[PDB]
Protein: Phenylethylamine oxidase
Organism: Arthrobacter globiformis
Amino acid sequence: ASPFRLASAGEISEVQGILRTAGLLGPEKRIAYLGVLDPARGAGSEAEDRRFRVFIHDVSGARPQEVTVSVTNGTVISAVELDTAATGELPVLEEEFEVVEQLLATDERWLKALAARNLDVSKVRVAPLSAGVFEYAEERGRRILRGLAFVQDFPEDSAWAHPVDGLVAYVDVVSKEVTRVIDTGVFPVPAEHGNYTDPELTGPLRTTQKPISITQPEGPSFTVTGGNHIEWEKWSLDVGFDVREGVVLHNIAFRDGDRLRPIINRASIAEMVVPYGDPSPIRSWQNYFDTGEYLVGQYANSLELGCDCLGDITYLSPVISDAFGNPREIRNGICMHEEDWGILAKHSDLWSGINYTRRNRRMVISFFTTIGNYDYGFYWYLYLDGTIEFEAKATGVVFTSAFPEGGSDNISQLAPGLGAPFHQHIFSARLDMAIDGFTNRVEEEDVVRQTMGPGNERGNAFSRKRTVLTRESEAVREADARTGRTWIISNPESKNRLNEPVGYKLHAHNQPTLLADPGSSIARRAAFATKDLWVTRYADDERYPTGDFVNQHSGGAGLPSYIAQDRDIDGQDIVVWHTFGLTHFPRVEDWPIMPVDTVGFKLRPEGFFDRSPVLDVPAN
Amino acid sequence: ASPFRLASAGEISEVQGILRTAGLLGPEKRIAYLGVLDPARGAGSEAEDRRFRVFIHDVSGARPQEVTVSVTNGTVISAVELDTAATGELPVLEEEFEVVEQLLATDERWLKALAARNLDVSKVRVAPLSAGVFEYAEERGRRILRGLAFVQDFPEDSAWAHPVDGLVAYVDVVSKEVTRVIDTGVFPVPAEHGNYTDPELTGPLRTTQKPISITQPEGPSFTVTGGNHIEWEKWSLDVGFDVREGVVLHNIAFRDGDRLRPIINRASIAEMVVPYGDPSPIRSWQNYFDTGEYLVGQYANSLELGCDCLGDITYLSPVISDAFGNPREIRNGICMHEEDWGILAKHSDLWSGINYTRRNRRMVISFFTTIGNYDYGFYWYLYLDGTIEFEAKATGVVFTSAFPEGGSDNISQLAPGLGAPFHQHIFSARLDMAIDGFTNRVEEEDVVRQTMGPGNERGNAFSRKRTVLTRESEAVREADARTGRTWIISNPESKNRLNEPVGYKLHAHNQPTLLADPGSSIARRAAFATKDLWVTRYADDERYPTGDFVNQHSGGAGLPSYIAQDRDIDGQDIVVWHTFGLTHFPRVEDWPIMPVDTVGFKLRPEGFFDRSPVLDVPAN
Ligand SMILES: [Br-]
Ligand SMILES: [Br-]
Ligand SMILES: [Br-]
Ligand SMILES: [Br-]
Ligand SMILES: [Br-]
Ligand SMILES: [Br-]
Ligand SMILES: [Br-]
Ligand SMILES: [Br-]
Ligand SMILES: [Cu+2]
Ligand SMILES: [Cu+2]
Ligand SMILES: [K+]
Ligand SMILES: [K+]
Ligand code: NA
Ligand code: NA
């Protein structure tokens, strides 16, 4: 039915079959990425052509390929060999996670380093860490992972409590070579365990928490049709899933009277990166593009009813490819439910004598992923009043190091001798806008203070100004919390009943952006993260602010290359890219497992409707 | 026998009898404010002395008085005549709300103004609006209210839909003189009604919302003892209520193993002001101290189960005084309940194989108040992980005006010819700190970026710095969202296991502060609102950031006056005052009754605990 339906197991198997038939998926080939492509613009009338894009890795050292296939027609649309030294390496494969530790286990330099620290190699876990691009010339064109070690005392021990500092190794995962082992000196391995299920650490469990029961006796207020089409309280959308981006929202629209009014064509988190701010050579290379390098979707957790998701839950179970092109279901990977959200509107009037109260609700679409030590929840909310919100919840175990004897300006202490390097978690939300359709524009709105004097004799006046961003060259914007800066996406050709263009206002949290020196590799590779807001003209091949291949890829792709085209964005099909993140100076309270912290953004209607859109909500 | 217990009806009627017998409450007297005084420092080595503070107004022209009585002993401790021209007028009385309209009804100037506009005087409501201090010398020492007119077409009509622009009057409520009527010219009275319960406006009500049932089979997890002492999930506190401030939290502490550890001695919203930014002389004087001038506590709503408060709710019903000293119960004026709050902590580990998830919850203490057109909900939240949060929810009906032909830089259009003047809602949270006791200090913490170079060769390093605020003269701080600025309250004499002072970190929303010109009357009378963070040395009589008598006070009272003392605040008994506000450019969606919008702040432990304080939370 719908061209926006989730990929099915059959489609994935068919992609495998088509690739095999075309001689593109022999036994040395691995699928590093596979996803369905959105329908082209103006396809609405066209019949379905379900197309999939695939990145294909070769374990024998041959060049990888990027391939697009039509599962509908059984054909390869295009297949190109990639020059990874130029355009980037493919995403990290799950089947490579164990390879770093396995290669190091027999390397004489690594063993000597462990011996110097009296560590048993059999107990030393090594993290499969993305490499970035630095001064090591031999890495260019090679598929490299770096390794940092953590001691696991026994099979269920949290290795994060026992970082092995002063030691790092680099590995070529295709040639199976350890290229470098760097030992800057021995640090004590912190000894305290961090086992949050150990009663000796938890103490006796609380018996004080009484149950909270959340039920819906008549079922949920939303409907699900065509597998992933949601209708709830005037909202309409399709819930997609991509192995790289995770949950993606399509065709967000609101039924206002008789018209289904588009708001956002596609919403996703198109990248997220964790740059570390410790200048030690052991970690100064660390920048984890959890989305672009590791693919957050593939590690989506199966969500347990009553634990991960509470209330009347409707699940989706998206299907992804394994490394060989076989379909694999992520059982209960997506939770959907509505929840009460307090008071919506309330007034008791001194003159009419009328008292009025209405309650609010939001629809929630979420998933939770795990990347190494991190676990992140991605939440999209739709509210009765037209507000759209995203929230990321960050938890997991903090990435650790030794804590230096004399203290540190770049690392906090979590436990005796145990450090946690400062870092950020920085997201990019890609919002392909469609305010009442595709003809859109963005205005930056600042509060305007006014000077006391003629026309303002009491010095109380204040105002605001809006600046239309007309060309991509002028659409790279920074926050200004002090002046209440927001950005309005409007449709200059669709007006409300008061004759103003309909719009939505983006409210950022105004958290710090990328802190790294602008001359750093990470400032170039995560350039998007240096500014709060970018606006581009829509293009088929402009999907991620970091480009298609982030792994071991220098600057040269992504948002800075897109905006160079300086295209008209004033009343055109545009895409907003919003950078937002957490700057994390870890606290003692974050150890041994961290309480959730959050960051996000929201958009509120701004003269989109002709009056409040929730006057028709009943009291009950 | 808690000294922090809510005032009882008996205590209030005892105050009444004491005053009356002392000849302080004759027929011309009105109680403008009455509240119980908190215990003084170190009076725990002493038996009961419940004392009440009362502001007494005289309707016949005599000077008002400030009186303190001991209900424990049935005596007047002090009674002082006030010089209102010097120290300010008393808060507005509810019984004065109809007085402006009544005085104008027989004034020839007012009647001429209405006649010209063909408005039936019997249908014209006049708002009882605080006057401020401007250029009118005759007003010094007089109790003045100003009035703006709104047409009510029938008893149940929303008058806000029909503002009468170009007209304003000033009245002396004691002498009953209309001092001035100002007519700057005729504006059309907007004609559309704003009756949000009229099916003509709401249309057919939604039938799509299915019920959400929230129950607690075994009851709530918190206990209430001594009327208002709450214990919940390691938290301990007393819930107070004052007619001016509303809900007040006392003695917030956390049970950490063997010890009850104090965190905040008293938390309240000590002021909130609504300054208007329309330079028209009809409104340019408008600044409503909802707390200081009107007293938000006295207008607290009775909260309906299943409507205002959902779930297993425990109510407090605070008692206040009426204008004559009679006790009045606000039935179900305070809601207390716990609610689920999503995921608390989660990690699935690639090396241990352990999958771990825990749920979060928060304790909620709230009330909802109405001041003219506004309705605000005040919410305090305590979370399992030690976080403390406040949230204000703003709703009601927007204060209206005409929308000028030609448009406006200071007014929004909500409906045909109907305008909404720009304004802010700015709150001050007074946090009498007690981090592990009263010896506290505050540090301002900024992110510190680092330059690429020696010691930072890859240009990835970043850090932070902390600056101790040592004296009040250097303790008036502004936000800096760009450098992630926060403020830490710590106890330099109480260290965690890692030998660092325990602390709590204040995270502000960094919204704009007061926008008015610094030379305006409002910048002087609401100086608190011009800066985000102030720290003072604790003092008994320093209660509000705007002083005791805000109404028509000339300026400089409160924080500017306290700060001028330049007291030591480095390891002393200190008070944090955080300014935070909404800057409101009303949108069409705000009309005819506004969807809730929110603002607030939170404090998170910062090395207060020796590790996560929620390891003992069970799986559930
Ligand atoms: Br092959
Ligand atoms: Br070992
Ligand atoms: Br959820
Ligand atoms: Br982390
Ligand atoms: Br680079
Ligand atoms: Br009298
Ligand atoms: Br509540
Ligand atoms: Br308002
Ligand atoms: Cu972090
Ligand atoms: Cu407002
Ligand atoms: K086919
Ligand atoms: K007594
Ligand atoms: Na678009
Ligand atoms: Na204090």
